[PDB]
């Protein structure tokens, strides 16, 4: 009824099942992961090492994206997917992925757009899927808000909830202990055994991007009779039901 530790990173991010692990830029620290500096280029990313048997979650993550007028960059994905410390162009994670990603996007790639960032977005891929960085990832994502969780004096939390189909994300920006919507859709299939993880990337702008903690949370959940006869971990990754 309650936290899930094996599938939680938590300083001092001493965890052993060693329950993450992490690769490119990705430091630890006794306060935080920091998955990319303040500098070019740079990559990196930390990976749960045990696959989530959970159908029904809610995963918070703590994180914190800061630097130094619109010129920084580019944000941090949260997964849920099938393959696990894979590199790559998408915020430091392969493309083509199967799954669920939530993008922390900061800069708007995209030169004559009319969304106002920093824009959080989820896009559930069956490895079909190419995510286009220049476009924002506008045309594979399935819903997004306006999230100001840049640079602010306080702490910033995330809230994404999966069940039944269901999947939301909601924030925690304003310090008010409230969570705020942002996004709620259905018919969402996802199967169970994939890895959570979080990955960031900076281009020609840069960032800090540290998450402190994400903690993984079991929910209480009636399901239908026909569904329990079903191999939830075979499930293919699909939209509109
Ligand atoms: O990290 C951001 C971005 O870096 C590269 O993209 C380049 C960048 O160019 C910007 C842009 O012209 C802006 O007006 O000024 C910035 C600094 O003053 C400059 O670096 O963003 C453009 C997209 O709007 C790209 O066409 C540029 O190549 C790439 O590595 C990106 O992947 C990354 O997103
Ligand atoms: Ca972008």
């Given at each position: 009824?309650?936290?899930?530790?094996?599938?939680?990173?938590?300083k001092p991010?001493?965890?052993?099942?060693?329950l993450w692990?992490?690769?490119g830029?990705?430091?630890?620290?006794?306060?935080?992961?920091?998955?990319?500096?303040?500098?070019?280029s740079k990559?990196?990313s930390?990976?749960?090492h045990?696959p989530?048997?959970?159908?029904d979650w809610?995963?918070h993550?703590?994180?914190?994206?800061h630097?130094t007028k619109?010129?920084?960059?580019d944000?941090?994905?949260?997964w849920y997917?099938?393959?696990?410390?894979?590199?790559?162009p998408?915020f430091?994670?392969?493309?083509?992925?199967h799954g669920?990603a939530?993008?922390?996007?900061?800069?708007?790639?995209?030169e004559?757009?009319?969304?106002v960032?920093p824009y959080?977005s989820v896009m559930?891929?069956?490895?079909s899927?190419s995510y286009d960085?220049?476009?924002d990832?506008r045309?594979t994502?399935?819903?997004?808000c306006?999230?100001?969780?840049?640079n602010?004096d306080?702490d910033?939390?995330?809230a994404?909830?999966?069940?039944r189909?269901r999947?939301?994300?909601?924030?925690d920006?304003?310090?008010?202990?409230e969570?705020?919507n942002?996004?709620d859709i259905?018919?969402v299939?996802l199967?169970?055994?994939?890895?959570?993880?979080?990955?960031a990337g900076?281009?020609?702008?840069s960032?800090?991007?540290?998450?402190?903690?994400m903690?993984?949370?079991?929910?209480?959940?009636?399901?239908?009779?026909?569904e329990?006869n079903?191999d939830?971990?075979?499930?293919?990754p699909?939209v509109?039901?």
């Amino acid at each position: 009824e309650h936290l899930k530790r094996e599938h939680s990173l938590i300083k001092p991010y001493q965890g052993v099942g060693p329950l993450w692990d992490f690769q490119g830029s990705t430091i630890l620290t006794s306060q935080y992961v920091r998955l990319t500096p303040d500098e070019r280029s740079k990559e990196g990313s930390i990976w749960n090492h045990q696959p989530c048997f959970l159908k029904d979650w809610e995963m918070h993550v703590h994180f914190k994206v800061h630097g130094t007028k619109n010129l920084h960059g580019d944000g941090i994905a949260l997964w849920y997917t099938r393959d696990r410390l894979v590199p790559g162009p998408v915020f430091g994670s392969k493309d083509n992925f199967h799954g669920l990603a939530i993008f922390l996007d900061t800069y708007p790639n995209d030169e004559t757009t009319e969304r106002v960032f920093p824009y959080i977005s989820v896009m559930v891929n069956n490895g079909s899927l190419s995510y286009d960085h220049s476009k924002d990832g506008r045309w594979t994502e399935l819903a997004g808000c306006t999230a100001d969780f840049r640079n602010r004096d306080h702490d910033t939390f995330l809230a994404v909830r999966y069940s039944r189909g269901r999947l939301t994300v909601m924030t925690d920006l304003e310090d008010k202990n409230e969570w705020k919507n942002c996004i709620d859709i259905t018919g969402v299939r996802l199967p169970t055994g994939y890895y959570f993880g979080a990955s960031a990337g900076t281009g020609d702008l840069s960032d800090n991007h540290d998450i402190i903690s994400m903690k993984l949370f079991q929910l209480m959940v009636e399901h239908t009779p026909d569904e329990e006869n079903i191999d939830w971990t075979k499930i293919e990754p699909s939209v509109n039901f």
